[PDB]
Design a binder for this molecule. Structure first.
Ligand SMILES: CC(=O)N[C@@H]1[C@@H](O)[C@H](O[C@@H]2O[C@H](CO)[C@H](O)[C@H](O)[C@H]2O)[C@@H](CO)O[C@@H]1O
Ligand SMILES: CC(=O)N[C@@H]1[C@@H](O)[C@H](O[C@@H]2O[C@H](CO)[C@H](O)[C@H](O)[C@H]2O)[C@@H](CO)O[C@@H]1O
Ligand SMILES: CC(=O)N[C@@H]1[C@@H](O)[C@H](O[C@@H]2O[C@H](CO)[C@H](O)[C@H](O)[C@H]2O)[C@@H](CO)O[C@@H]1O
Ligand SMILES: CC(=O)N[C@@H]1[C@@H](O)[C@H](O[C@@H]2O[C@H](CO)[C@H](O)[C@H](O)[C@H]2O)[C@@H](CO)O[C@@H]1O
Ligand SMILES: [Ca+2]
Ligand SMILES: [Ca+2]
Ligand SMILES: [Ca+2]
Ligand SMILES: [Ca+2]
Ligand SMILES: [Mn+2]
Ligand SMILES: [Mn+2]
Ligand SMILES: [Mn+2]
Ligand SMILES: [Mn+2]
Lengths: 232, 232, 232, 232
């Protein structure tokens, strides 16, 4: 079995294991702040430096993975708390879209909301152009921010949210369990064929963004990950 | 929302929140030992005392849950390491089958391997009578120990195993992530309609068993659980 | 070469290869519980029955050794989690100090913290009388519980900790590597001359203790050992 | 704390986590064969793809590490069993020396035996030009194959050897424990200042080589590694 596993309880600038793209910043307390509160259309993304081989062309096997992380979003004054965070899986050469407008693209797609990635979003702003639900929500995105499936949710300012994600290679099911701070859990599951949507080697990470009038603190506090590919 | 959540880092024998059935015994270190090493066809089960309402007849809503626990199985001399542990969901009036032969029934079914429950088994012995796979395995059981679906696994004596289970009400998907001792993860998922297989109120718990020649240490070390039923 | 090697994956009460002193008790799962949770100044120790010859008077040779074990400490209610575990090397006639007060003496020293032994401690309580650091720590003790050298550490209740110790005869260096639950490793090393501090034949083992208000579960789960003395 | 940890029980071609350099080959059983038995001056090296940051320029902290691996060397007919294996730590841009003559350079140094690396060698051939001891031996190399310190050892054809290495940041002590096939352990320790000899980011790996007349099977069977840098 081919297994990749890591665990970050705090992050630091200068760690070869992590790739920073955009307005990312590592705070003194170990937290990663994804966007710059003073920039227009700010976009920040952090990825695990090492590419993970999620499926094999030789055997046709797809890996299963278990990951869990925790974030926090907080309101800053005079601005609309937007736009949110997205845990994504993209090709190994992934870069922030060329003329990114930040905002509702969450830093992973273009103006129409298209991109090459699969991910779980925690959207705090309703962009009608992307057919966003009228409330905050968690959604599964497959090559687009016009979510394949969404579930109502509620982002609480200053609250530490915990998430657990399991992807079963067999059923190709991606399930998410979000534990809010009030104790209640929110779940969403969807069948996604990683092998048909992504290349053999990909990179996992987080991305967040804002606009001109929408800005808020997007923090990543911890992240653990484990994937196992059955080699034959 | 109607939420039920508990967390046990250690168990104790005078806890009204726990029901002991069979040869269960609480060791001095807080662990629960499910079977009696010196009893033939030994069977032991532990259940959360309070019935959890998983579905409503009024709204037709089914609850979503997130639970994780860790156990350890260890070999004892001169005996075949058998038969295994099962995390199960059963009617609130659940009792050890009358005249249980222990062994391959895992303490939840009758001689043919039938019963009323839904669970995830960690089977360490191949019972051809229940169509068991030729290796150790994790399986999803629905009213029978002839698993609806199994995945090969490997039970390491004296190793602490961690499991995480997520059941998404919408897709009715039950997914399991088992983190072995060597870091490798094993997963299995299956669509199970709790509302059609179980009553409105059920009890969650664990069960293990042995035979005449098959006996081993079955321990439960910790258990956290959280379920949320949307009431409206 | 004169080599002594053994490996315990589980312990049992009628084993002539093991000496039990004090409140030691072997649980049904194979684990050794060093202290009695109901006794006031409780002290329990377990030693390998056979004396190991660590140095020759003939050829001034000292033995090199590689050992690794794993333990678990857990909080019990209403009591301060104290006092800790110590892996020690002592004269073959070693016995629990006469009139031992348990507590910060860790079962190996007198009231002032003096004794005849060398060992690695995993201290979970700061005894100012022994100049203990203000946090949990691992320390190297040479004839006293006022550690020659300490390193900060963190004891996690119910966590299985693994340790590996290497003593290099040439450099007389004792180095320890503690693998926390967390994945993080802690190390400490110190030059200790076994030949000048201990006699030719010694006994290896573990010891733990508690006080009136300080009590917790001290468990030893496994232990392998190999020593080689060059004879020529 | 910044921790990096991985565990390989078997290797595979096409794993992004591993860099193959030279005549390396992944056998069908999962073992890595470092040298080509049919090539003159054969050299093969395998490295962990991701650079590990061993020390910080910010806080003058150095990381501690614990690693253990197992190898096997086997005689092939008509050839001198040479030249050995070396576990090394080198700059992230490390490549096989231009114009390497294999043989006694072990694939990490030039003709004089100089290079930029720190490692532990398991030398099976006495090269007088590098002041090699007259017998097989384990040695600690610091920027040269003219070992800083060596200890006699004995390579047994077809025997699986296990090694454990601990580097304690504080004392800057590197200690090695080699468990031979017959149960006897061999140890060697040396104070090495990684911060003064190596850059902030390095790569860990293995290297082996042969000559025209000296060739043998050099295999790597498993490898686990964990390093922790105190960030603060
Ligand atoms: C100066 C100003 O008026 N700018 C806003 C833009 O910020 C706005 O874009 C959206 O803003 C919200 C937050 O208010 C979200 O971030 C959303 O994703 C953005 O699309 C655009 C469109 O409303 O219009 C005004 O210019
Ligand atoms: C004395 C002896 O040989 N008895 C065995 C039984 O223990 C055995 O029952 C099975 O035993 C295995 C372990 O070996 C499992 O526990 C299984 O569930 C049991 O059914 C029966 C049937 O094989 O036959 C021999 O008696
Ligand atoms: C009931 C109670 O308060 N008793 C305590 C003692 O337990 C205590 O002894 C020390 O206790 C700590 C744990 O809190 C360590 O075990 C220490 O080694 C013991 O000396 C004594 C002295 O502080 O006094 C109060 O009784
Ligand atoms: C055909 C033959 O005679 N070749 C040898 C060389 O192999 C030899 O090189 C050394 O070989 C030994 C093993 O016998 C080791 O691999 C050593 O490191 C090599 O230097 C050279 C020098 O002895 O000369 C003869 O050609
Ligand atoms: Ca949006
Ligand atoms: Ca079975
Ligand atoms: Ca103390
Ligand atoms: Ca040589
Ligand atoms: Mn959305
Ligand atoms: Mn089965
Ligand atoms: Mn101390
Ligand atoms: Mn050499």
């Amino acid at each position: 079995a081919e297994t990749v596993s890591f665990n970050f309880n705090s992050f630091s600038e200068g760690n070869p294991a992590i790739n920073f793209q955009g307005d990312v910043t590592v705070l003194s307390n170990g937290n990663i702040q994804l966007t710059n509160l003073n920039k227009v259309n700010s976009v920040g993304r952090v990825l695990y430096a090492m590419p993970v081989r999620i499926w094999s062309s030789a055997t046709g096997n797809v890996a299963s993975f278990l990951t869990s992380f925790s974030f926090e979003m907080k309101d800053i004054k005079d601005y609309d708390p937007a736009d949110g965070i997205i845990f994504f899986i993209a090709p190994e050469d992934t870069q922030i879209p060329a003329g990114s407008i930040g905002g509702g693209t969450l830093g992973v797609s273009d103006t129409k909301g298209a991109g090459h990635f699969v991910g779980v979003e925690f959207d705090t702003y309703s962009n009608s152009e992307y057919n966003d639900p009228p409330t905050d929500h968690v959604g599964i995105d497959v090559n687009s921010v016009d979510s394949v499936k969404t579930v109502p949710w509620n982002s609480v300012s200053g609250a530490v949210v915990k998430v657990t994600v399991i992807y079963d290679s067999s059923t190709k099911t991606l399930s998410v369990a979000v534990t809010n701070d009030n104790g209640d859990i929110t779940t969403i599951a969807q069948v996604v064929d990683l092998k048909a949507k992504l290349p053999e080697r990909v990179k996992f990470g987080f991305s967040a963004s804002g606009s001109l009038g929408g800005r808020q603190i997007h923090l990543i506090r911890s992240w653990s990950f484990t994937s196992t590919l059955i080699t034959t």
